[PDB]
Amino acid sequence: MGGFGLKNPPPQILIKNTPVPADPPTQFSSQKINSFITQYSTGQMTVEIEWELRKENSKRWNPEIQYTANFNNSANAQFSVNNNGLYIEDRTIGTRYLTHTL
Amino acid sequence: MGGFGLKNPPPQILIKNTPVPADPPTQFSSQKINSFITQYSTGQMTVEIEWELRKENSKRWNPEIQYTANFNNSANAQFSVNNNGLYIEDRTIGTRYLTHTL
Amino acid sequence: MGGFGLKNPPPQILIKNTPVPADPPTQFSSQKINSFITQYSTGQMTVEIEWELRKENSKRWNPEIQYTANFNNSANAQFSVNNNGLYIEDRTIGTRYLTHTL
Known part of the structure; x- marks a missing residue:
């Protein structure tokens, strides 16, 4: 399903x-x-994760595809509540946009 | 026409x-x-400019408009030479995409 | 096709x-x-490569197949120019002759 396979994952x-x-x-x-x-019972929780990430150095001249919000005027702004107060994800977002040489 | 007005511009x-x-x-x-x-006569020249730039810290939840390449398959890739070898800018690009509170 | 697969091959x-x-x-x-x-334009280039190689220790009694030049008297010596001055490789040579236990 995609992810990071771990021998010793975070503890339940x-x-x-x-x-x-x-x-x-x-x-x-x-x-x-x-x-x-x-x-x-009830309460609050918190989760703080430190992520490592790889810089992008690419010398391609021309511009690249990037993730942008839709260009239509919509009744409800994207990734936002509606009149009734319900949060809505409008679509999935993958992580692959920038290119790399094979 | 837009730009940076200077009392003491770069020397001619x-x-x-x-x-x-x-x-x-x-x-x-x-x-x-x-x-x-x-x-x-002929030769080569070089120009090296140090630019200062402002970081972007914005807490808006939802995503923003960004500049992306066109989504159509085209005969000629954008911002690239054609068969005859001529470089072509397909359109102008302004600098205002990210938003800011007024 | 055979070779050494490299993550970071020699630079173009x-x-x-x-x-x-x-x-x-x-x-x-x-x-x-x-x-x-x-x-x-024209000029000269040079390439100097340091190769590492593995010694051969084998206790087999009897002799082994080895690469030898052909035994016929030929009009043109092998791996050598002809009358017209053209260099000729007579056949391919693989590296596997000496044996080893499985």
Whole structure:
């Protein structure tokens, strides 16, 4: 599917809500606790990645194809929300534009 | 016409072929020398200019218009010679594509 | 086709005769200079390559096939000029003669 094959990829990150039981009975019972307190959690996360990239030195005279926004006036600007507030990717973008000698 | 107005622009550069006279007469004559040796000169020149330029920091989410080569298959590649060997600029290019807040 | 595949092969070497124009007209004209002075150049070149090579240690008793000149008396000696002065390679020579265990 494309990507970077890794022998030792980034570690999976796993999270759970610690179970909190409801009020137990007064007489002891050895069965598992069936009923818990309904709860959920929320928060924020962050991801910071350092990318390495290769400079482009090419002596071709004439100009090259590059990625540009569409030239039509549209009802909704590209890669932007609509009236209802929904974000929309208008099309996929590949990374291959600049050329290189074979 | 657009450009950089300068109080002290780059100096003009002026060049001439030094005149070489033809064979003078043996008897002295005080008039100007009318006839010279026909000659011309040629060589190479170079111009090296150091340009300063302003970085672009803009936080707009969506992509921008950029200059790209035309998308049609053409008989002659753009900004390139033809069969006869003549270099051709296909169109003018202005410098204003990226946007900026007013 | 056989050879040594290289990521960074020996650099191409490119050479040109610098164009020298013919006598220009006296009235200025902005068109390209059509006519030049016909000329060509010549000289000598040299190439010095350092080759690394592998010694042969083999304990096989009996003798091996080796490349030898043909045994017939011929009108023209092999790998040599003819009467008219033309150099002639009589046949191709591969590098595989000595044997090695598999």
